[PDB]
């Protein structure tokens, strides 16, 4: 639907939609920008992530409200409406995964971009896994795990332990371990070693990078406090 709009105009309008908190519009603009076929800059990747994160975030919150009502009940209306929301959520996840597969990941050669997209791939398979119940749940979980694992391997080889994308990836892989894979010990160990190794690399950072890294370290600490 965005094929007739200039790439730069779609990016400009994505930033306007963020300011207007119009995240569905923001995601459609960034989807159009991706479909121009050019690689995304660091800022453009962040715009893509923020847009779909907010869209799917609202869907996940709604799904959890309805799933909780459905469980308390167990007419067809609650199940029907949970299914409707669930189907829409799955459609958004499939759309993101399709963008990563056609063709963001295969053209991403630098560590920052490749890790960023593999993290996204893990996240959106994780969101699919949150609602999975049929014969595809195990394969969905392994698809999330595999994407996270490849991103972790690259980040550990190519990035410093304080790199924000490396920290956010480790944070989300640890939530995957705790919430999806039923591996809370793995989640705790990952969160602790990530925090400790970042703490030991903070002395190399500027004041601005220091603030960036310690902000995400605090999320690792929040989870460790909740989990232990």
């Amino acid at each position: 639907a965005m094929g007739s709009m200039e790439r730069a105009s779609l990016i400009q309008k994505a930033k306007l939609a963020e300011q207007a908190e119009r995240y569905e519009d923001m995601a459609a603009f960034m989807k159009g920008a991706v479909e121009k076929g050019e690689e995304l800059s660091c800022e453009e990747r962040n715009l893509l992530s923020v847009a779909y994160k907010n869209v799917v975030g609202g869907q996940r919150a709604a799904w959890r409200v309805l799933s909780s009502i459905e469980q308390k009940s167990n007419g067809p209306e609650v199940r029907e409406y949970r299914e409707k929301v669930e189907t829409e959520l799955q459609g958004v996840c499939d759309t993101v995964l399709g963008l990563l597969d056609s063709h963001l990941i295969k053209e991403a050669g630098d560590a920052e971009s490749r890790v960023f997209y593999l993290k996204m791939k893990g996240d959106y398979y994780r969101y699919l896994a949150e609602v999975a119940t049929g014969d595809d749940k195990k394969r969905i979980i392994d698809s999330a795990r595999s994407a996270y694992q490849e991103a972790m391997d690259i980040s550990k080889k190519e990035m410093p332990p304080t790199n924000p994308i490396r920290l956010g990836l480790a944070l989300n892989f640890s939530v995957f371990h705790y919430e999806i894979a039923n591996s809370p010990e793995e989640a705790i160990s990952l969160a602790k070693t990530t925090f400790d190794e970042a703490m030991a690399d903070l002395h190399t950072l500027s004041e601005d990078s220091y603030k960036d890294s310690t902000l995400i370290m605090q999320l690792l600490r929040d989870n460790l406090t909740l989990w232990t």
Partner: peptide
Amino acid sequence: RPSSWRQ
């Protein structure tokens, strides 16, 4: 319940 990455 736990925190994944957020702005």
